[PDB]
Nucleic acid binder design. Structure first.
Lengths: 75, 158
RNA sequence: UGCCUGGCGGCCGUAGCGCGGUGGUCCCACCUGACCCCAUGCCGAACUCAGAAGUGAAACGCCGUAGCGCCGAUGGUAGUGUGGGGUCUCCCCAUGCGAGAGUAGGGAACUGCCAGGCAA
RNA sequence: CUUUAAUGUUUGAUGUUCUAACGUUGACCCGUAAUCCGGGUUGCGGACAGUGUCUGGUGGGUAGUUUGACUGGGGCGGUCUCCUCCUAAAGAGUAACGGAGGAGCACGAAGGUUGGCUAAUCCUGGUCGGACAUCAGGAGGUUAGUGCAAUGGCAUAAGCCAGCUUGACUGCGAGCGUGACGGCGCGAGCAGGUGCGAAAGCAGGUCAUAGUGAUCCGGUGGUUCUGAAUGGAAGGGCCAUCGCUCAACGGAUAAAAGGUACUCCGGGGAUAACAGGCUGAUACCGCCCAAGAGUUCAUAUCGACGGCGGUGUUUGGCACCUCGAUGUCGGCUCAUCACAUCCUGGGGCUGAAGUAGGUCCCAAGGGUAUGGCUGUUCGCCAUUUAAAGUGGUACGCGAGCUG
RNA sequence: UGAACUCGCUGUGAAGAUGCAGUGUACCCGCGGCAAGACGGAAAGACCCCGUGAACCUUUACUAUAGCUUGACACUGAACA
RNA sequence: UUUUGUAUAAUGGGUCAGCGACUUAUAUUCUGUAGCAAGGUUAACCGAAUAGGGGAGCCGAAGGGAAACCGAGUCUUAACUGGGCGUUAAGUUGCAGGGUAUAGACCCGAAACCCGGUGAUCUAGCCAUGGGCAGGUUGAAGGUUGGGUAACACUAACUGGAGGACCGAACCGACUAAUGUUGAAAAAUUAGCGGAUGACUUGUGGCUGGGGGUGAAAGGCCAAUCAAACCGGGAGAUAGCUGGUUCUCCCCGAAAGCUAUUUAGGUAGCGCCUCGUGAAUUCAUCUCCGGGGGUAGAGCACUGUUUCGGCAAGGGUACCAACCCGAUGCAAACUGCGAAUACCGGAGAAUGUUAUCACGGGAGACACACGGCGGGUGCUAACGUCCGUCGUGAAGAGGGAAACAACCCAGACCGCCAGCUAAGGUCCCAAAGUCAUGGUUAAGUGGGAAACGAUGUGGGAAGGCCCAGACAGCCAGGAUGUUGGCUUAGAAGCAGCCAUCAUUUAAAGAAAGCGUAAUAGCUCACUGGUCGAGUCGGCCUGCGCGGAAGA
């Protein structure tokens, strides 16, 4: 009776460090907020991070709680 | 816990009721206590045809899911009871006529028991005429007269 | 140039807690009244207005204290990719990488900018 | 004109009487040596009956069809869409009739903005009140809460309270994610007009995933877009929206339940039943530590609590050969071989005085029945002996015969 | 009847070997008998399943109808209460 | 041929000779070829005609939108910093070829439906007309005779003549057994059985003609065939199903995977296969750099689970127990920690026939099995089933393993009487060391198998006593109360409550075995003398034996 199957949400990280991205590109697909947007990174309603400008995605740890932050630099 | 099989069966029953009320005539619709919106939807379903009619019937059933159905079921039950009584009377008349044509004296006795006022002489004459018509491939005038006489006797009894 | 003070950031538990001492020259805080601005599902509690009379108790800044919390090697160990062996539902050999915990040790902070008091 | 009254017109529902239509397989006469048929007279019923079209109902008697898919033979039992966790092997994705559970809502606010605020568990004091109501203080740092089952996240609070509004608006949307595709989601940014806020700025719904259904067709509002000669209208085309547990949920019809041993056709050991093979839970047998029984004394004889070993003699699973044919249980003739030996033969121990016995080793050279019970293999009973042994050979033998 | 110079045992082998590996035996060719096997020959299995295959049958499965049957319209009229 | 898979004992074949399988027409897409070229091109038809006329007609060069309409612009909106579709490549007519759809379109093999006719000499029933059914059996009504009653009834006799009656020929039925199943016959023959004056049979003639006829009513028979006869047509019906598809050579050469499907053996889309065109050190290997995990491992901060000890709400205080505290564990559904592989992007030396990507034409396939790696399931059994990756076979021959595709080494262009080598072997069959060095084994272990057991063998840590001479042996001793109080029935040491004393002492205990009702008696604890050197209890074990019996 149990074990009913449901299509996966295809979450994960789409863009990794060292890869240039364009404005509006989706960086990471997450259900909650595992990573927090920083400079040049915007967060949508579905807790999805996107790039507002061209650059290379970067990841840093900041804040009192040491939460992981995703930021983009124009390089 | 509600079984989805039971839910599907209930939906099928609701759709059957919707189709039956749609098929019903104008007088039946007037008699049945239907709301204005449901009446308009039923009229639209009757006007339309093809898959549109079936999907409008599906809408009718979906609305009936929430709307009460007991008055509608009662009205349909009484109308069907009247129709079935009429059909059963017609079937009894037809079977009695067939038995009169086939057997003879036994059917005459049955007719007399059902209606004491029935004329044995007239029934015998009509049966003999029907047998002669059957033998001579003549029109079933005797059979029609027997049917009319039985209908008159039934009306008098009722 | 520094003993100090308040704010703006990086780093964020070597960065936070337990104990004692240390400060009113400026700043900070406490404090007085709120008639008026301000608001309490009631209150100057919270916030705000005019003062600083009075003080450094609480908090706040500094120092010592290792008692915690925390970081933390080296080596070893578990594990594991590659090609093999065996008493092959498990283990071992050559090679590469390499844990967690614990130990020695560190540790009770560092740093850039602005503005004010002291002596220079 | 609403309302009434005498004559005169149209007639309809209804009753009676009549016959000229209509039937006479009633009688008489002729064509006619004629039970057919036609023609002339009469009687019988007579606008009845029936006939042709339509219509209401009945109508497996007849004609055309359906009765989906997964399933540890098949039926029954359970499921057909979406969401959360593990299996799912540290990108994504990944099956099972695997294990745990939910959804087909709801909110004119529970949405946007501005401002402010921060719970569980316990201790202390206090009228009902008591461990657990509410009040004050103490540690706390998310264990609270975040409408719905679950997951992650939420201190800037995505949590709670208060002032205003509907940005839950219209026309687009670069650039991406996700699937083979239809399709679905994110998305900075441009034009118009708005809500909050003095403002930087936020608002294109709900902290975030399920709450949904393509296409055809129809319903409502707008559009001279077209409207088959002209001027219109009807009908069409487009924009906005509504209509399906089409739950068989990527949905073949608007419309469909079962048997065939009277069946057939083309195939499948892709797929079963008897036999073969693998495997060995179960079944039989042997043994180990050993509590204990055995008049004391464990192993003369049994021997629980546990485990270890051989076989396929019953019950188990795959169907790997076989459905272009392997004839599947018993009886007879023919029998073959192993010893886990019934007796005969040689031996050990004995709770073995002797005959008669209890247990174990070697030895298969040899023998190893008849009747009743069932079809029976097998097993029970009665009678004799030395016994009337256990097993493998398609549970031997239907290319031997009767079922 | 694919062709045969067509022995037995152990194991394997699409899983029951005349034909594989090892082993043992056996002169060649005829005739009268037994029948273990060449999963002997016979029927593109009647048994189980597949087919949106067929045919018959059942109906309160679907769609129509013969037949039955209600009424209207013409044959079908005349007198009046 | 089937399949993951064949000599397999799954399929077909006896062979020879002949015949036999992707053709043809209409329209569409692409390739090669010929021309013209912003033009190409003719159909029908005329035509002393494969010529020449015929520009009727069709296709692209200008597209967008549904259309109006607009125009190298168009569609959306009052319109965009906007977005989709057009421009910067040239189309057309024939030939041949690769597909597409229509026509039976690769072929053979079905059941089954309708239409138009033929049959009742076979067979079933009915009608009309004739014959046959030996022979022998008891006899119901009626009549007659004697007795009998007032008269009947009744009785004993003659005549009398009906049996789906009895025995029994011919004849009829096949009810049973056998003969045979290409037969003697496409259902007949032999031996019994049943009837043998009745719903009997038979010669002859006619009718009942196929969603129908007939059936003393089993789906039986209807010209050897019947749950729907035969003959011709629709029709070469359809068939997701069986089977076959015939000459050669070279190059490349996969899969049984994902989504979908009234879908599971059928088929649509993507990856995978192939040829062509256009494209970037495009991609792969390896080094370095930046990455997020939550698997192994470890742990229990949290979620469940588990044992112990304590405070213990609550509950009925010797009594059960919540919320918790300290320790030990476990978890694919827990992570305060956490890797190696796996994957993304960047930089780089070198190799790889661009091994990388886009498009077009055609495919094939959508049954996979095994081992290794971490598993679900199953019994951590199955040559059992399902997952992510490599390989094998399918699609790969060879050598080793006795034979075995998944076990090991190894990728066949062809030939040569050449050498080397991988795995595996060197006593031989059968090619090579009866090689060398130091050991283990005394069992055919090698050359199937475990819990357990054991003076088998070599060694190690060792451990106790040992020429003030150890162990076991060789002629010697074990004398006396201790016949005990005690349960005195006798235990006296040889069953127990009990001390576990004491003299001779080179030496003896108030006691270990054998048996007597207890006695008694014989050994052993220790002690005189000679020889005398070494002696004894376990652990680790590699190699050995039993447990190990099947036709």
């Amino acid at each position: 009776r149990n074990g009913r199957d449901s299509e996966a949400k295809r979450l994960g990280v789409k863009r990794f460090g060292g890869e240039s991205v364009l404005a509006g590109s989706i960086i990471v697909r997450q259900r909650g907020t595992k990573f927090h947007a920083g400079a040049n990174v915007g967060c949508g309603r579905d807790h999805t991070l996107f790039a507002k400008a061209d650059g290379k995605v970067k990841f840093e740890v900041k804040g009192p709680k040491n939460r992981k932050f995703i930021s983009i630099e124009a390089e | 816990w509600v079984s989805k099989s039971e839910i599907k069966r209930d939906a099928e029953e609701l759709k059957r009721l919707g189709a039956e009320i749609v098929d019903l005539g104008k007088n039946a619709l007037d008699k049945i206590p239907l709301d204005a919106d449901l009446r308009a939807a039923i009229e639209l379903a009757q006007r339309i045809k093809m898959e549109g009619r079936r999907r409008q019937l599906q809408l009718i059933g979906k609305m009936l899911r929430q709307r009460d159905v007991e008055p509608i079921r009662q009205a349909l039950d009484k109308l069907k009871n009247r129709h079935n009584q009429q059909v059963v009377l017609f079937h009894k008349l037809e079977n009695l006529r067939d038995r009169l044509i086939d057997q003879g004296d036994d059917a005459i006795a049955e007719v007399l028991n059902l209606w004491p006022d029935a004329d044995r002489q007239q029934l015998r004459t009509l049966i003999r005429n029907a047998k002669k018509e059957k033998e001579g491939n003549k029109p079933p005038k005797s059979a029609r007269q027997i049917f009319q006489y039985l209908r008159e006797l039934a009306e008098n009894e009722g």
